Structures are given as C-alpha cells and as structure tokens.
C-alpha cells in the first residue's frame, strides 16, 4: 500500500498574480520594428 494526502485537480483551481503598475511599460514588450540589436 501507500498513504498520502491528496488535493483534487479541478478546473476551478485558478491563480491570481499581482502586477506592478509600470510592468507593461517595459522596453521589451514595446519593441520598434528596427532595433539596434
């Protein structure tokens, strides 16, 4: 045998991360068509 606790993977299991306010104004999510790279 084996004994363990057990948490069911139901599709109602969500997760809520928190973003900073100036997160999406980052120089990688906003790239021009022609960079120096």
């Amino acid at each position: 045998w084996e004994h363990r606790r057990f948490i069911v993977a139901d599709s109602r299991n969500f997760i809520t991360p928190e973003f900073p306010r100036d997160f999406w104004m980052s120089p990688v999510f906003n790239l021009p068509r022609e960079t120096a790279a």
Binding site: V28, F29, L31, R33, T35, A37
Partner: protein, 71 residues
C-alpha cells in the same frame, strides 16, 4: 567584380547606391544583370551588402519577438 569597384573608385564613393545616375546607367548598358539590385523598391535582402544574409536572419528574429510580446 572589376566594374563595380572601379565605377565607385573613379567617383570616390563607398556605396554604389550613392553613385550618380549618369554613372549608374552606364553599368546597366554593359551589364544587364544589375537591374534588380539597382532598380527595385523593397528588396527582401539589402542590396550590395556583405552581411545581407546575416541581416536577414536577424530580421526574422525580431519579427518573432514582437509576435510574442504583443500577443
């Protein structure tokens, strides 16, 4: 390879796009293979360059980055 240097060496010009149209039309009369890299609006490669392939793989790399971050 002889003409494309000497036509630019006589005019002291480093890049054959900056050549005068009196000089550019002279090469087209002798050498008709130079139509596309001289008289094309938007070539997929940068013409008369050496890293022209090396630019090309670097442009698809950028276009696949902005495909991610916008999505």
């Amino acid at each position: 390879a002889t003409a494309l240097t000497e036509a630019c060496a006589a005019e002291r010009v480093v890049r054959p796009h900056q050549l005068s149209p009196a000089g550019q039309a002279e090469l087209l009369l002798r050498f008709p293979a130079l139509e596309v890299p001289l008289r094309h609006p938007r070539p997929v490669l940068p013409p008369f360059d050496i890293a022209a392939e090396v630019a090309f793989t670097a442009r698809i790399h950028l276009a696949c980055l902005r495909a991610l971050g916008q999505a």
